[model samples]
Target: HMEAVQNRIVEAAERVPGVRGVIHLRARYVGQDIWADMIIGVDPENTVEQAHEICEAVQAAVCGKIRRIESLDVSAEARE
Candidate 1:
């Protein structure tokens, strides 16, 4: 299951136009809850809005493909 989710993330990252990198923070399952965290790196030249779009795209992709994701937290980092 983890591998499938990871694969979906990679696929989404590759598909998002302005995405520079994708890092999976953590994935854990405690009883009935599934927790996930990730960071999406955007092109340094793009605006914060672009980064948000990338995050949304990634989240949408994950939601579409993975059903067991009870909760997700996504963030973005810009290269300096």
Candidate 2:
């Protein structure tokens, strides 16, 4: 049940750029929330807009693909 959702989020995360990695991910099939903590790079290679955009992409990808998600939070930030 929850396994499939995790897989989908991974796939979505991997597809995005400027996303260095996923810090953490927690979901409650009952309540509270479903959120993904993503670590993004803020080096010269990528811009802030790009980083934020990647986060949005991940959110859209997950929410779009799966309808069971009641609520989602995709928080992103730079390592340095």
Model 1: per-residue lDDT, tens digit, 1-80? Answer: 66666676567655766667775557677664556888877777888888888888877776666667677777888854
Off by over 4 Å in 1: 1-4
Weakest ten-residue segment in model 1 by summed lDDT: 24-33
Q: Per-residue alpha-carbon lDDT of model 2 for 8-31, expressed as tens digits?
A: 776666666556666667766666
- After TM-score superposition, what is the CA distance of residue 32 in candidate 2 from its true location, in Å? 12
The CA lDDT of each predicted structure is: 0.71, 0.65
What is the TM-score of each predicted model, taking all chains together?
0.74, 0.65
Position 14, candidate 1: lDDT = 56
For model 2, name the residue pairs that clash: none
